[PDB]
């Protein structure tokens, strides 16, 4: 994957915490359509995020995301026990391209 | 004498009548949109020719004067045997050839220039 | 001090919308051929439209905002539906068509014979036609077919008093209403336009249908335009114009005849009768040598706008319906397609005969994809022959090699190539301006 | 908006394996459709979108000369059709709708809000 | 310079092209309604134009002084640095903000008070 | 003398009215609105003081141009969509219920229908209603077969009544009556102008206006006289009344196929248990809202007398019932139980039988008929009821009770309830005065 994720990210429900996107200057860095999908348990991926910042409805405010330059990132507020999702950042490099996921643990294991 | 009434009439007299046509100028589904089409032509038609007043030196009815000079090549003749001896059908007869550069002179030669000159000597 | 003073009858325009009515030639007066379908009740077009060229002025021009388009393109849907409801209804012609070949050796050409409610409804006739492979779809004894759209549409024969030639129109602004004509010879459709001159009506482009390529255009700029919002945009279709028009010859060698078959009391439709020679196929010809240098002048621009020179292999079309994979176009009353792959397979790095491109005839027709209402284009008798020259290509880029194909299907874009240079602004005539100026009381 | 997909299929290596998504609660004709393949435990994987209107497609570098995805306003069907399979074919597919019409500006690389259920495809050696 | 033709020009030099411009504004089943509509829509638009440049105090026509004077601010320029330094186009781009409340009050200021006023002095 | 241009003068006129709806779902161009133009985001409401005019909702002839627009929006509205012509045809019909009346009401007819071949037929089944066919000497057959014909409202379109303004053209303004207590005719103490009215739902419905206003924070009777036994009385509430109009059955659509491109939408089984619509109002704030109707009705005939509610004399079924639509299907509710209270000098909620009844002519136009497709699943709405069109029976010699029922048919009352407060007058801004001035020579 042209965007590169890292493997897993693990923390507690309550909290605040991040993950990054961390692309070139040709998928992220020069366009703006970055997107953040959230695949379900052997479900399909739905984005949480639409844009360089943009969320549809359907969708709490906790989730916060904006490109930092080449280094997109998203935010997971509040932490819940439903969190339990690995989450796909998306972005438009002359093409679709996915992401490698994060998987994602509260009040568990890593 | 009504509409169009006194046409015939000399403009001694015709000078006299022009306030009744300009009254009944706008006169005050098919087979009716015949007369929405009708009604709409009659609207155009009567502000084009207010238009031509306007942008003429007149911005008034029945009488306007001017500082443009008039030109032999438009019925060449004395006052005379233009105003006792003709109609103004014969003579439009005879003078509907000029009538696009006679209205173009009588508008830009005077409102391209006296209102200019009215307007500068009010800048004074 | 200083006063204010306003001016009646200011030069001054800006961005709107307003219907924009015709002007036709008068040409045409003299050859109706019973209302053509382009113009009926087109005015006479201005015999000396008076193009003031305007100096020290410049406009912001956008032909993918452009709404002249749009309006075009719904006045032509409008104008073809409107001529298309007089015409002879066609719910008889759905019936169980007993049908075989035509080939005696070793589709295309089907010989369907069915049922017909004649003049008399109390008695039913049998009757034959030729209907083409792509006009009819098996029903699963011979194999029993049914027209294509039989199940989805209804189908009207368009009446054959009209005609299709792409008649020279015109888009004249209303009064109050000017359009700026964008002359500048380098434009490539936004951006400020150097030399913007106001005209009364539109150059005049035929409203030509087409999908691979555009023919019957105009295109002044020497060199080709690639012309798209984004060209980094891969699905953003890049639209083309070559500089040079290609002379293209498609012809119809089939001596198809029509044949009128009475459908009920007041009613028939023209069938077609037997191919008279050979069953031969349309075919369209275009000079290779002129058909590569014009791509050499189009991978040119290409490379100059995507980079410097990159490699560019010219593929057939990835997808669409039939009118989008095969170029689309009317050559003389009859709607047929051509695969076009003999014009779309040059792979280029860096740097006499005739290509042949196989046509297929299609004679009911949806076009549009106005779904519910489609079209039954009548036999044209004897061959049809038709020469035209290319001078725009709708192209799409593909996701150091940039594949380009062609692409189309949206009619948005055969007027885009043509109201590229065209906007619509209204007059506002009034204008306040300061002056010294002061009146009496 | 929902979109049901096809059921299960069980196909082997060099076959051709084609797969349904209907379309239900909105203009079929103005929403470009992405094919989106998903590998069980692998990254995500996009096949081609379609543009219901003229039927306009558009395939991957990679699937480029597999693939062949097509669509009939009739039934409102979507129809993706994958041939030359491979052992790394057995993936589940999904078919998704964007956001905003095909007139947006940039529609055609949206988000793909809505999704179908998915179909799954097993290619494998074994009979 | 023909309709539309002096656009780019200096204002100074515009104001000899008002007139003809204002001359070409009224240009004298389906697919032929959009004449009829268009027609119609050209001919109030018009009538919209001179209602307002009537009801302004004046009724006449390229040229409409008045008593209501131009603050400074809206201008933020002088006489010269006006007529001379940018034409029309980008003068009404940069005042395209105030001409609703610059129309109002120069019409009403100027009418309701210049007007009766006008009719007291000739009421004695 | 002196002549004003912009004098303060209006007159009692008749004139065209435009519309204009809100922007907020176009849903293929909703019955209502599809061409309307723009609402006024910011409806400025002028107050007006020293202002009389003389209001007379009946003489009004805003309500006969608002009849009209609708029948004549019904009409455009269903011309384009499917014929119904073929469904004339012998129905073997049988019953479905097998428990003595357990739901007639649900009638399983089998037929014959043209598939899209002619040359073949089919066999089709629907469930229609005992209200919507009549049997032929068992054999049924469509009620309206032999007087009109069948037009099905194409089911892309709804029938939700939008709020819709009708707003006069230039010249013309429109008086709205503020004043609280207003009886329908004589002087307005509170007139205010406005561009054009608040939003009205075009409702269809008999003896009680669903969905109208309800500002007239009074029960105010209104009639043309109220001494006229045989003109309607009508009544507008202040507080509304709730109303759960359901239908439990859960229909499914079965698109039985008509073609060419013609579908006839017949209902399948209805997946669940047999039930009837049935329309609930609660009985203590209907008892309350009587008891405030009665308390005003004792106004207009003595100071105390007996006032008895009785169930709809006779007619049709559009007016001995309550007629209207829920979620986009025609049924009535006999209301017999909200009128059967008698009033001398002084929790749950009333049920009501509802029957459905597709097929429909409402307006009473023998021209045309209309066939009101089966909506999937339970259709289920709350409205509020905001008047009674009550009509008042004879009286007799010692009219010491007086007995008020239920009234209707002609649609004019349903939309006097929304324009009773409304009228329209012309400008004439040209008049003479006297004056001390002097023109010049
Ligand atoms: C007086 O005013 C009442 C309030 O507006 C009105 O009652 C509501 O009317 C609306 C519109 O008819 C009802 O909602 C729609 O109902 C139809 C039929 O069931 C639906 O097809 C439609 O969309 C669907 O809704 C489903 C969920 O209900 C959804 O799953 C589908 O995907 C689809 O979106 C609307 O739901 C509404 O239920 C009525 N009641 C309520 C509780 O608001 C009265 O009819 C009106 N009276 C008159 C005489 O006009
Ligand atoms: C009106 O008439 C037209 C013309 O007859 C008709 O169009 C056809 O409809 C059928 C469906 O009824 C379409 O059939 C499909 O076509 C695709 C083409 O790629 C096939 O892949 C489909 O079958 C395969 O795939 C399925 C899963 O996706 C499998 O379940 C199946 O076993 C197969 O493997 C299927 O055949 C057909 O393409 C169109 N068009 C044509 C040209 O036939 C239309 O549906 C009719 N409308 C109505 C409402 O009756
Ligand atoms: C692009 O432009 C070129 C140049 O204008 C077009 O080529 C010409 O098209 C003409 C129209 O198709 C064609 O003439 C005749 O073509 C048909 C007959 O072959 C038919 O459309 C008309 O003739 C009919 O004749 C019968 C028998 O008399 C009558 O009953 C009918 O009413 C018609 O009159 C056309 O007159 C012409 O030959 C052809 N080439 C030349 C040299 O002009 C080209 O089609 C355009 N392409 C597109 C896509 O529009
Ligand atoms: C109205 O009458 C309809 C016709 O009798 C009835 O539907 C039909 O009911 C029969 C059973 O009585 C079904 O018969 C078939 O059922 C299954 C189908 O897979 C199999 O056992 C056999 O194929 C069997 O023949 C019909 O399929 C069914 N529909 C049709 C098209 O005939 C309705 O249910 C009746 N409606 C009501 C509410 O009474
Ligand atoms: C299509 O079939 C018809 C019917 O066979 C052909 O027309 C008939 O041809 C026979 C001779 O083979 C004649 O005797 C008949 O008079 C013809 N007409 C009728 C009404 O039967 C027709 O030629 C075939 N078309 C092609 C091109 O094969
Ligand atoms: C565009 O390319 C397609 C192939 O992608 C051409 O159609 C055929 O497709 C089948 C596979 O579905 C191949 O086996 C054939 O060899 C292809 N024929 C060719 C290459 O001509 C299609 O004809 C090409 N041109 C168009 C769309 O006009
Ligand atoms: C089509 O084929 C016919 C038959 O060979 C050619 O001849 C004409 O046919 C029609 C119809 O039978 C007759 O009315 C004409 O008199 C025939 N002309 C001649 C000279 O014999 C016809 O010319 C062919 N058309 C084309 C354009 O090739
Ligand atoms: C549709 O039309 C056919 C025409 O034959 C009807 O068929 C007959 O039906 C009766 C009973 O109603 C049988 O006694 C006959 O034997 C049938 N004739 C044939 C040739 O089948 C059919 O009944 C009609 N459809 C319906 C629902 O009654
Ligand atoms: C008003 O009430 C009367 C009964 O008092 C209704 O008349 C009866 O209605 C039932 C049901 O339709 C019939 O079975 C009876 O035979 C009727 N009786 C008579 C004497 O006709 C009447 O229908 C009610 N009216 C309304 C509009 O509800
Ligand atoms: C009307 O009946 C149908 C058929 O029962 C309902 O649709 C679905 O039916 C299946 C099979 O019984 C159930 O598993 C589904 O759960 C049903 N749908 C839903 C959303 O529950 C349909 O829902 C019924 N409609 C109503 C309003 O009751
Ligand atoms: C509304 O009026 C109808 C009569 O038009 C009432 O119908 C009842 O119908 C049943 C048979 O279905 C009879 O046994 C009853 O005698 C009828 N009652 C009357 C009053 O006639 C219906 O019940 C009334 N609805 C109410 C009272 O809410
Ligand atoms: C247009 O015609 C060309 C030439 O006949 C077609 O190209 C061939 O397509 C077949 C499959 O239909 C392949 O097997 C051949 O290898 C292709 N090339 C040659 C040289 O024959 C082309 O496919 C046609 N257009 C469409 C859309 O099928
Ligand atoms: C007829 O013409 C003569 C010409 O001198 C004129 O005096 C007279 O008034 C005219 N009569 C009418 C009624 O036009
Ligand atoms: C008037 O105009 C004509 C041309 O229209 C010209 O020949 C003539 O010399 C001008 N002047 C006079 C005095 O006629
Ligand atoms: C135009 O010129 C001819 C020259 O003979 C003259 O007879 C005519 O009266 C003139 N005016 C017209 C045509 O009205
Ligand atoms: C002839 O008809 C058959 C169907 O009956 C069809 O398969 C075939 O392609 C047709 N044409 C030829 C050349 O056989
Ligand atoms: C035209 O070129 C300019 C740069 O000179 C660019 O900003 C603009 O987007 C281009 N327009 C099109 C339609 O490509
Ligand atoms: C297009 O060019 C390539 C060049 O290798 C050739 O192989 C191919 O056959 C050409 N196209 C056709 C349709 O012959
Ligand atoms: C076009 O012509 C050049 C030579 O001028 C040749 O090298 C090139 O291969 C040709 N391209 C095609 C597609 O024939
Ligand atoms: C293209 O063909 C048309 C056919 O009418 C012709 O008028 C035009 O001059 C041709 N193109 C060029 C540039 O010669
Ligand atoms: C353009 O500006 C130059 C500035 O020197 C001026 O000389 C020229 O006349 C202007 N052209 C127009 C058409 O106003
Ligand atoms: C001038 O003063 C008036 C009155 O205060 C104000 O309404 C108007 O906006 C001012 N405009 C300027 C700055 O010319
Ligand atoms: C109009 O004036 C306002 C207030 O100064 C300003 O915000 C706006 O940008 C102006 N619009 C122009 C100059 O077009
Ligand atoms: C059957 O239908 C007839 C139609 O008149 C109806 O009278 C009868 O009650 C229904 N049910 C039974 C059990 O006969
Ligand atoms: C007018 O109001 C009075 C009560 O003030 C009422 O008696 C009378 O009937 C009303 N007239 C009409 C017809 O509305
Ligand atoms: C009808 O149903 C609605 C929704 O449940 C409820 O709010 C309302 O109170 C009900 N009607 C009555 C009269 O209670
Ligand atoms: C209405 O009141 C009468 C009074 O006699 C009673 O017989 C009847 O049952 C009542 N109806 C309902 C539905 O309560
Ligand atoms: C009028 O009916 C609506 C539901 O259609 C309800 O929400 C409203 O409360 C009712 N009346 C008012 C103004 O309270």
Same mark, same amino acid.
């Given at each position: 994957?042209?965007?590169?994720?890292?493997?897993?990210?693990?923390?507690?429900?309550?909290?605040?915490?991040?993950?990054?996107?961390?692309?070139?200057?040709?998928?992220?860095?020069?366009?703006?359509?970055?997107?953040?999908?959230?695949?379900?348990?052997?479900?399909?991926?739905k984005?949480?995020?639409?844009?360089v910042?943009?969320?549809?409805?359907?969708?709490?405010?906790?989730?916060?995301?904006?490109?930092?330059?080449?280094?997109?990132?998203?935010?997971?507020s509040?932490?819940?026990?439903?969190?339990?999702?690995?989450?796909?950042?998306?972005?438009?490099?002359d093409?679709?391209?996915?992401?490698?996921?994060?998987?994602?643990?509260?009040?568990?294991?890593? | 004498?009504?509409?169009?009434?006194?046409?015939?009439?000399?403009?001694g007299?015709?000078?006299?009548?022009?306030?009744?046509?300009?009254?009944?100028?706008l006169?005050?589904?098919?087979?009716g949109?015949?007369?929405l089409?009708?009604?709409?032509?009659?609207?155009?038609?009567?502000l084009?020719?207010?238009?031509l007043?306007?942008?003429?030196?007149?911005?008034?009815?029945?009488?306007?004067c001017?500082?443009?000079?008039?030109?032999?090549?438009?019925?060449?003749?004395?006052?005379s045997e233009?105003?006792?001896?003709?109609?103004?059908?014969?003579?439009?007869?005879?003078?509907?050839?000029?009538?696009?550069?006679?209205?173009?002179?009588?508008?830009?030669s005077?409102?391209?220039?006296?209102?200019?000159?009215?307007?500068?000597?009010?800048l004074? | 001090?200083?006063?204010?003073?306003?001016?009646?009858?200011?030069?001054?325009?800006?961005?709107?919308?307003?219907?924009?009515?015709?002007?036709?030639?008068?040409?045409?007066?003299?050859?109706?051929?019973?209302?053509?379908?382009?113009?009926?009740? &087109? %005015?006479?077009?201005? /015999?000396?439209?008076?193009?003031?060229?305007?100096? $020290? !002025? =410049?406009?912001?021009?956008?032909?993918? +905002?452009?709404?002249?388009?749009?309006?075009?393109?719904?006045?032509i849907?409008?104008?073809?539906?409107?001529?298309?409801?007089? &015409? %002879?209804?066609?719910? /008889?012609?759905?019936?169980?068509?007993?049908?075989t $070949? !035509? =080939?005696?050796?070793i589709?295309?050409? +089907?010989?369907?014979?069915?049922?017909?409610?004649?003049?008399?409804r109390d008695?039913?006739?049998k009757?034959?036609?030729?209907?083409?492979?792509?006009?009819?779809?098996?029903?699963?004894?011979?194999?029993?077919?049914?027209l294509?759209?039989?199940?989805?549409?209804?189908?009207?024969?368009?009446?054959?008093?009209?005609?299709?030639?792409?008649?020279?129109?015109?888009?004249?602004a209303?009064?109050?209403?000017?359009?700026?004509?964008?002359?500048?010879?380098?434009?490539?459709?936004?951006?400020?336009?150097?030399?913007?001159?106001?005209?009364?009506?539109?150059?005049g482009?035929?409203?030509?249908?087409?999908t691979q390529?555009?023919?019957?255009?105009?295109?002044?700029?020497?060199?080709?335009?690639?012309?798209?919002?984004?060209?980094?945009?891969?699905?953003?279709?890049?639209?083309?114009?070559?500089?040079?028009?290609?002379?293209?010859?498609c012809?119809?060698?089939?001596?198809?005849?029509?044949?009128?078959?009475?459908?009920?009391?007041?009613?028939?439709?023209?069938?077609?009768?037997?191919?008279?020679?050979?069953?031969?196929?349309?075919?369209?010809?275009?000079?290779?040598?002129?058909?590569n240098?014009?791509?050499?002048?189009?991978?040119?621009?290409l490379?100059?706008?995507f980079?410097?020179?990159?490699?560019?292999?010219?593929?057939?079309?990835?997808?669409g319906?039939?009118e989008?994979?095969?170029?689309?176009?009317?050559?003389?009353?009859?709607?047929?397609?051509?695969?076009?792959?003999?014009?779309?397979?040059?792979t280029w790095?860096?740097?006499?005969?005739?290509?042949?491109l196989?046509?297929?005839?299609?004679?009911?027709?949806?076009?549009?994809?106005?779904?519910?209402?489609?079209?039954?284009?009548?036999?044209?008798?004897?061959?049809?022959?038709?020469?035209?020259n290319?001078?725009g290509?709708?192209?799409?880029?593909?996701?150091?090699?940039?594949?380009?194909?062609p692409?189309?299907?949206?009619?948005?874009?055969?007027?885009?190539?043509?109201?590229?240079?065209?906007?619509?602004?209204?007059?506002?005539?009034?204008?306040?301006?300061?002056?010294?100026?002061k009146?009496?009381? | 908006?929902?979109?049901?997909?096809?059921?299960?299929?069980?196909?082997?290596?060099?076959?051709?394996?084609?797969?349904?998504?209907?379309?239900?609660?909105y203009?079929?004709?103005?929403?470009?459709?992405?094919?989106?393949?998903?590998?069980?435990?692998?990254?995500?994987e996009?096949?081609?979108?379609?543009?219901?209107?003229?039927?306009?497609?558009?395939?991957?570098?990679?699937?480029?000369?597999?693939?062949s995805?097509?669509?009939?306003?009739?039934?409102?069907?979507?129809?993706?059709?994958?041939?030359?399979?491979?052992?790394?074919?057995?993936?589940?597919?999904?078919?998704?709708r964007?956001?905003?019409?095909?007139?947006?500006?940039?529609?055609?690389?949206?988000?793909?809000?809505?999704?179908?259920?998915?179909?799954?495809?097993?290619?494998?050696?074994?009979?």
């Amino acid at each position: 994957s042209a965007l590169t994720q890292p493997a897993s990210v693990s923390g507690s429900p309550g909290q605040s915490i991040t993950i990054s996107c961390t692309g070139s200057s040709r998928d992220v860095g020069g366009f703006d359509l970055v997107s953040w999908y959230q695949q379900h348990p052997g479900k399909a991926p739905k984005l949480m995020i639409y844009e360089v910042s943009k969320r549809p409805s359907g969708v709490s405010n906790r989730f916060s995301a904006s490109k930092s330059g080449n280094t997109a990132s998203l935010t997971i507020s509040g932490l819940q026990a439903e969190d339990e999702a690995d989450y796909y950042c998306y972005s438009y490099a002359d093409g679709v391209a996915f992401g490698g996921g994060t998987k994602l643990t509260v009040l568990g294991q890593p | 004498l009504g509409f169009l009434g006194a046409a015939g009439s000399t403009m001694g007299a015709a000078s006299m009548t022009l306030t009744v046509q300009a009254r009944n100028l706008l006169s005050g589904t098919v087979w009716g949109i015949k007369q929405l089409q009708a009604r709409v032509l009659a609207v155009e038609r009567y502000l084009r020719d207010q238009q031509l007043l306007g942008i003429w030196g007149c911005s008034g009815k029945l009488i306007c004067c001017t500082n443009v000079p008039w030109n032999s090549s438009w019925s060449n003749r004395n006052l005379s045997e233009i105003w006792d001896n003709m109609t103004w059908l014969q003579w439009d007869k005879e003078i509907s050839n000029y009538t696009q550069i006679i209205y173009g002179l009588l508008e830009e030669s005077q409102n391209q220039q006296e209102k200019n000159e009215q307007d500068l000597l009010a800048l004074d | 001090n200083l006063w204010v003073t306003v001016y009646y009858g200011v030069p001054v325009w800006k961005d709107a919308e307003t219907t924009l009515f015709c002007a036709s030639d008068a040409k045409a007066y003299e050859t109706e051929k019973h209302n053509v379908w382009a113009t009926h009740a &087109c %005015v006479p077009t201005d /015999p000396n439209p008076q193009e003031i060229h305007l100096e $020290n !002025v =410049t406009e912001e021009f956008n032909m993918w +905002k452009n709404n002249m388009v749009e309006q075009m393109h719904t006045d032509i849907i409008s104008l073809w539906d409107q001529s298309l409801k007089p &015409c %002879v209804k066609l719910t /008889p012609l759905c019936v169980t068509l007993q049908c075989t $070949n !035509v =080939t005696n050796n070793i589709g295309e050409l +089907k010989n369907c014979s069915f049922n017909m409610t004649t003049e008399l409804r109390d008695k039913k006739q049998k009757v034959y036609s030729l209907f083409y492979r792509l006009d009819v779809v098996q029903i699963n004894s011979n194999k029993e077919y049914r027209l294509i759209n039989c199940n989805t549409s209804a189908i009207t024969q368009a009446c054959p008093k009209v005609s299709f030639e792409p008649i020279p129109i015109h888009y004249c602004a209303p009064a109050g209403f000017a359009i700026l004509k964008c002359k500048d010879k380098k434009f490539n459709g936004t951006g400020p336009c150097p030399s913007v001159s106001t005209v009364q009506c539109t150059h005049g482009i035929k409203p030509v249908v087409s999908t691979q390529l555009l023919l019957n255009g105009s295109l002044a700029e020497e060199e080709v335009m690639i012309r798209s919002e984004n060209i980094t945009n891969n699905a953003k279709n890049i639209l083309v114009q070559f500089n040079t028009p290609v002379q293209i010859n498609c012809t119809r060698p089939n001596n198809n005849t029509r044949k009128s078959i009475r459908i009920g009391p007041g009613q028939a439709f023209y069938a077609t009768g037997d191919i008279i020679g050979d069953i031969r196929q349309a075919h369209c010809n275009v000079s290779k040598a002129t058909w590569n240098e014009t791509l050499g002048k189009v991978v040119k621009q290409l490379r100059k706008h995507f980079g410097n020179n990159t490699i560019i292999r010219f593929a057939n079309s990835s997808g669409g319906d039939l009118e989008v994979t095969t170029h689309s176009f009317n050559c003389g009353g009859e709607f047929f397609y051509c695969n076009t792959s003999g014009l779309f397979n040059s792979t280029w790095i860096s740097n006499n005969d005739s290509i042949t491109l196989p046509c297929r005839i299609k004679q009911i027709i949806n076009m549009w994809q106005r779904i519910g209402q489609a079209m039954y284009a009548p036999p044209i008798q004897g061959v049809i022959r038709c020469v035209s020259n290319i001078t725009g290509l709708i192209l799409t880029r593909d996701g150091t090699t940039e594949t380009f194909r062609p692409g189309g299907g949206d009619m948005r874009d055969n007027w885009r190539s043509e109201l590229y240079k065209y906007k619509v602004v209204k007059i506002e005539p009034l204008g306040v301006a300061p002056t010294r100026c002061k009146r009496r009381v | 908006v929902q979109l049901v997909q096809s059921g299960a299929q069980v196909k082997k290596p060099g076959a051709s394996v084609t797969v349904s998504c209907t379309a239900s609660g909105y203009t079929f004709t103005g929403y470009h459709m992405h094919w989106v393949r998903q590998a069980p435990g692998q990254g995500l994987e996009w096949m081609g979108w379609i543009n219901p209107f003229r039927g306009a497609v558009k395939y991957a570098q990679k699937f480029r000369g597999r693939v062949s995805m097509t669509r009939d306003t009739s039934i409102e069907i979507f129809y993706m059709e994958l041939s030359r399979l491979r052992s790394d074919d057995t993936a589940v597919y999904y078919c998704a709708r964007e956001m905003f019409d095909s007139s947006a500006d940039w529609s055609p690389w949206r988000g793909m809000v809505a999704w179908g259920q998915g179909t799954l495809v097993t290619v494998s050696s074994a009979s």
